Amino acid sequence: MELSFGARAELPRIHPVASKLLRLMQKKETNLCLSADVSLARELLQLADALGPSICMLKTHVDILNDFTLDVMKELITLAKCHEFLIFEDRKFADIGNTVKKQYEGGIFKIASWADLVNAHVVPGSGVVKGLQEVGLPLHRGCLLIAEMSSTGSLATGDYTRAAVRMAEEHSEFVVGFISGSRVSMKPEFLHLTPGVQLEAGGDNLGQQYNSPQEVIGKRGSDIIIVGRGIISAADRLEAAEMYRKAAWEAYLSRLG
Amino acid sequence: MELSFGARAELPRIHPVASKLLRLMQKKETNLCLSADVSLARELLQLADALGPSICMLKTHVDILNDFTLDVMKELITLAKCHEFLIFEDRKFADIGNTVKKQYEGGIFKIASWADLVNAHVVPGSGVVKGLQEVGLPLHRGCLLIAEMSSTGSLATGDYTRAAVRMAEEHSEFVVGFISGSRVSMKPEFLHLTPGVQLEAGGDNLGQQYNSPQEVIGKRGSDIIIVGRGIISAADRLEAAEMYRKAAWEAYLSRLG
Ligand SMILES: N#Cc1cc(=O)[nH]c(=O)n1[C@@H]1O[C@H](COP(=O)(O)O)[C@@H](O)[C@H]1O
Ligand SMILES: O=c1ccn([C@@H]2O[C@H](COP(=O)(O)O)[C@@H](O)[C@H]2O)c(=O)[nH]1
């Protein structure tokens, strides 16, 4: 039987970051993650403040910000605390353990100092998670493993996907779930987040493929939709965010019965 | 038929960045890529200057440099031109095509502006290559696809590796080779660069595994060794680089005939 997000937040083996997230999802009736794919810090902060009420999570690509500073991220954290959403840096860590630990903690971005969640590809083997967790565990962070991808020709299928699930299971002190197109774990402590989402059928010209919130949440059993252009390119981004939220939220409620 | 690096530089289908690399490998008698895994720009540049005559390539992780600026990269380019080596940013692009184009061109790092070579994981499908190529083509840049990894539990094996080789063949206008543990293509226009290399047997505590230059170049048929800690951890990095250079170069001479 399916548990509500609020009940899942209380599960004995739940990660604190997953619990925080699940509680605010239930409080705000949102399972929408905004993909804030913009080049200017002011745009990032403007979207975060305006859409924050409607979202459970803000997904960043800090490496495309033409004017990144750590003060930008300080300010984003204030907004995250005010409007109640988590910050997920979509870094796709994909190197050996010794390297990713440095990429997570250090450099100019100091990602671990501000991102509640990061994600990682499983292709290097479990050392990618071991390296990240050496930085993330002390800082009370969580990680998502990329079990499937939305893009045309994705190799994250079959035995690769099963490997991602095993890796998460064996590293549950740090891994809180998956980037995937569908439910891949039967354990309710894990979150499923799905990108490649728009209301209308389509794709882009560089291999992105879309499915609807009803399909991904309702039929495929994912928890959270990740939506970028579907919202950001709309004339009215507030109304678009609300349309996606309502869609994902109702799909969840229906599945839950 | 085994061709020298100088001959391979003249192959009909050779990419101009591969040709430039192969020419300087032959001229300088080096098939050593230094993995400059340091956190300080001064150490990076001092290594680049001192070891430049010994290396064909300097591999960077600019996202670990605590004091990155574009002015640091300008000085690195100056050293690369002076000593004759290529700059390879080991970014491991691994996102959908629309995202990686921005991560390559933009942000604070503006990687395409200074890196001769970058690499990409093949897990997203060929969109990853199509996105990078939109940026790299007019700038006369090249890309390496990660066909195999050196780390314990790597999923880059079997059909995954074969998919990487097919993707390289189909995008030979931009893809100039592979990150691999051995020769994965029989086409001599492709470069093979191999990380996980040390003179001594062993590994690290986070999944790295090492093989020797003689094994990797000599028996496994790779072209270039990528060496980080085996050089960086030495008291005298120049002497260490010279050790690796001579090992790798003589291994190469042996399979030539
Ligand atoms: N290239 C690459 C990459 C992929 C791979 O499969 N194995 C690696 O070690 N690397 C990188 O090569 C370097 C290996 O360094 P070391 O020789 O283990 O100190 C690192 O910068 C690591 O991030
Ligand atoms: O498998 C994946 C993994 C990540 N993303 C990311 O999610 C967002 C998709 O945005 P859009 O296609 O909704 O604009 C982008 O930031 C992209 O990098 C995907 O689309 N698919």
Q: Which domains does chain A have, with CATH numbers?
A: 1-257 (3.20.20.70)
B134 C-beta closer than 6 A to ligand 1: no
Distance CA A121, CA A129 (A): 9
Q: To test the ligand 1 pocket, which listed residue (B178, B226, B229) has its Cβ within 8 A of the most ligand atoms?
A: B226
B23 C-beta closer than 6 A to ligand 1: no
Q: Is B13 annotated as a binding residue?
A: no
Distance CA B4, CA B15 (A): 16
For an interface test with A, the pick among B38, B63, B101 (most A C-beta atoms closer than 10 Å) comes out as B63
For an interface test with B, the pick among A67, A69, A72, A99 (most B C-beta atoms closer than 10 Å) comes out as A99
SS3 label, residue A159: helix
Of B154, B169, B146, which is closest to residue B208 (Cα–Cα)?
Answer: B154
Of B148, B141, B84, which is closest to residue B118 (Cα–Cα)?
Answer: B141
The residue with tokens 């990032």 is A44
Chain B environment of A95 (Cβ under 8 Å): 90, 92
Chain A environment of B62 (Cβ under 8 Å): 107
Whether B92 is catalytic = yes
* The pair of three-digit structure tokens given for residue B251, joined into one six-digit string: 């291994």
The residue with tokens 């700038």 is B139
* The pair of three-digit structure tokens given for residue A193, joined into one six-digit string: 């987040």
**Kind and range of the H or E run holding B60:** strand B57-60
How many Cβ atoms sit within 10 Å of the Cβ of residue B102?
A: 20
Query: Which of B125, B156, B208 comes nearest A123 by C-beta?
Result: B156
**Which residues does A253 contact at the CB level (< 8 Å), separation at least 6?**
none
This structure was determined by X-ray
Distance CA B26, CA B16 (A): 15
The answer to whether the CB of A62 falls within 8 A of the CB of A77 is no
**For chain A, what is the radius of gyration of the CA atoms?**
17
How many Cβ atoms sit within 10 Å of the Cβ of residue A187?
A: 12
Distance CA B187, CA A199 (A): 45
Rounded to 5 degrees, φ, ψ at B57 are -160, 145
Distance CA A239, CA A241 (A): 5
A145 C-beta closer than 6 A to ligand 2: no
The answer to whether the CB of B158 falls within 8 A of the CB of A131 is no
Whether A95 is catalytic = yes
How many Cβ atoms sit within 10 Å of the Cβ of residue B16?
A: 12
Helix B41-51 with B70-83: angle, nearest 10 deg: 10
* The pair of three-digit structure tokens given for residue B24, joined into one six-digit string: 């300087």
**Kind and range of the H or E run holding A17:** helix A16-28
The answer to whether the CB of B228 falls within 8 A of the CB of B35 is yes
* The pair of three-digit structure tokens given for residue A225, joined into one six-digit string: 């939709």
A153 touches chain B (CB under 8 A): yes
8-state DSSP, A56: S
How many Cβ atoms sit within 10 Å of the Cβ of residue B226?
A: 21
Distance CA B109, CA B252 (A): 35
Where chain B is discontinuous (C–N > 2.5 Å), the residues before each break are none
**CA dist list (Å): B87 to B119, B143, B180:** 12, 12, 18
β-pair partners for A142: A117
Q: What is the largest CA-CA distance in chain B?
A: 47
Distance from CA of B254 to the nearest CA of A (A): 31
**CA dist list (Å): B12 to A2, A49, A66, A236, B166:** 61, 55, 39, 53, 20
**Which residues does A235 contact at the CB level (< 8 Å), separation at least 6?**
none
First to last CA, chain B: 10
Distance CA B63, CA B82 (A): 25
B113 touches chain A (CB under 8 A): no
Distance CA B43, CA B55 (A): 16
Of A148, A188, A185, A151, which is closest to residue A168 (Cα–Cα)?
Answer: A185
Which conformational region is residue B219 in: left (phi greater than 0), alpha (psi within -120 to 50 degrees), or beta?
Answer: alpha
The residue with tokens 């705000």 is A28
Beta strands, E only, B156-195: 175-179, 191-194
**Which residues does A60 contact at the CB level (< 8 Å), separation at least 6?**
A36, A44, A76, A87, A88, A89, A90, A115
The answer to whether the CB of A137 falls within 8 A of the CB of A107 is no
Which ligand has the shortest distance to the CA of B61?
Answer: 1
β-pair partners for A145: A120, A178
The residue with tokens 């008291």 is B235
The answer to whether the CB of A13 falls within 8 A of the CB of A189 is yes
The answer to whether the CB of A66 falls within 8 A of the CB of B107 is yes
Whether B74 is catalytic = no
Number of CB pairs < 8 Å for A and B? 169
**CA dist list (Å): B224 to A138, B5, B52, B89, B171:** 38, 11, 15, 16, 21
Chain A environment of B230 (Cβ under 8 Å): none
Beta strands, E only, chain A: 32-35, 57-60, 86-93, 117-121, 142-146, 175-179, 191-194, 224-227
The answer to whether the CB of A92 falls within 8 A of the CB of A150 is no
The residue with tokens 């002190």 is A173
The answer to whether the CB of A189 falls within 8 A of the CB of A18 is yes
Distance CA A208, CA B124 (A): 10
Distance CA A28, CA A7 (A): 15
**Kind and range of the H or E run holding B89:** strand B86-93
A88 touches chain B (CB under 8 A): no
